[PDB]
From a paper:
Two enzymes, peptidylglycine α-hydroxylating monooxygenase ([name]; EC 1.14.17.3) and peptidyl-α-hydroxyglycine α-amidating lyase (PAL; EC 4.3.2.5) working sequentially are the only proteins known to catalyze this reaction. [name], a two Cu enzyme, catalyzes the stereospecific hydroxylation of the glycine Cα of peptidylglycine substrates. The two copper atoms in [name], CuH, and CuM (located in the N- and C-subdomains, respectively), each use a single reducing equivalent from ascorbate to catalyze the reduction of molecular oxygen for the hydroxylation of the Cα of glycine at the carboxy-terminus of the peptide substrate. Crystallographic data on apo wild-type [name] and on several crystal forms of three CuH mutants (H107A, [name], and H172A) presented here show that the copper ions are required not only for the catalytic steps but also for substrate binding and for locking the overall conformation of [name] in a configuration that is catalytically active.
The situation is different for the crystals obtained in the presence of 1–3 mM citrate: they diffract to 2.5 Å, the space group and cell dimensions are different from those of the wild-type and contain two identical molecules in the asymmetric unit with bound citrate. Neither molecule contains copper in the CuH site. When the N-subdomain of the [name]-[name]-cit structure is aligned with that of wild-type [name], the C-subdomain displays a rotation of ~18° toward the N-subdomain, compared to its position in the wild-type [name] structure. As a consequence of this hinge movement, several secondary elements of the C-subdomain move as much as 15 Å closer to the N-subdomain. These changes result in a complete reorganization of the coordination of the copper in CuM. The two histidines, His 242 and His 244, remain coordinated to the copper, but Met 314 and the fourth ligand in wild-type [name] (a water molecule) do not bind to the ion. Of the two vacated Cu2+ coordination positions, one is occupied by the 2-carboxylate of citrate, and the other, surprisingly, by the Nε of His 107, originally a copper ligand of the CuH site. In the wild-type [name] structure, the distance between His242 Nε and His107 Nε is 11.7 Å, while it is 3.9 Å in the [name]-[name]-cit structure. The arrangement of subdomains in the DBH-cat of molecule A (closed) is highly similar to that of the [name]-[name]-cit structure (RMSD 1.19 Å for 195 Cα), including the position of the single copper ion of each structure (difference in position of the copper atom in the two aligned structures <1.6 Å). However, the fact that this conformation was only seen in structures with a single copper ion ([name]-[name]-cit and hDBH chain A) is more compatible with the conclusion that having two bound coppers has an important structural role: locking [name] (and probably DBH) in the catalytically competent conformation.
Residue numbers in the entry: 60 to 356
The structure:
Amino acid sequence: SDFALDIRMPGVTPKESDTYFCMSMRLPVDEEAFVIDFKPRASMDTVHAMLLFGCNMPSSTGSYWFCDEGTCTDKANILYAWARNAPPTRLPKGVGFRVGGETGSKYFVLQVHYGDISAFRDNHKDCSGVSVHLTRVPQPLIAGMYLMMSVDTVIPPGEKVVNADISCQYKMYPMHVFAYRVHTHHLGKVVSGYRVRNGQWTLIGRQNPQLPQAFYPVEHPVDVTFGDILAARCVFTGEGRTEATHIGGTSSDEMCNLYIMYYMEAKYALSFMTCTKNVAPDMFRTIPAEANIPIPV
Ligand SMILES: [Cu+2]
């Protein structure tokens, strides 16, 4: 019934720091399949991050391309992401990302963001990637991904604390949140995500981004529903920096990401949602104190 797909780079070798390689893999069937596990084949000393997308039109036809060219032409739904030697990610029973079928993606696209060019003095060839475990047994609970991401953060040099706040109004069919992944680069201290319902903040996740950036389970899994606000804060420092630090594509720039894995009932399910905004900036007046206390490793 099941099968696995090994999505690995074809022996690539970067020639400069912060190089982004992308490749695609066709789903071997067109009928409906479900992704239930993710096993990364990758290490921090070479790879800054991987992202895995579902789509129907990959941005190029070659064995691999530079990701500046695009990931997918159509909507690239994020399935999975990885960074700091995170262990495998396994979905709760009855839950899988839905691919193939009339509705679903026919291609995976893998982005690998390689780190420092030191790791290739060697000139070795790289086969980093993910192995994915699909099943054709229909799952009643379809997983999707909600990405909260900052696009305007400036971290002035040396400032002890900078908060980066992300908030969107939730207006879709009910989702049920069960795991999360936080991401920053070297300046990030703690990253927190919340569901805010009538002034009451309900923790989704709180993690140190310097720990392996796994999909950690949501301690008390929670419904997010029409009318709610989803809110996240990354706490940064400017210490150890000469100039301002901007949001960017290299390991010396910053990023504030919260990835929330959710499920929905098959019939009304959505794959991928996005917040790159801060709609409700004064709402953070009452964010809990825990969002600015660091998690001591
Ligand atoms: Cu990054």
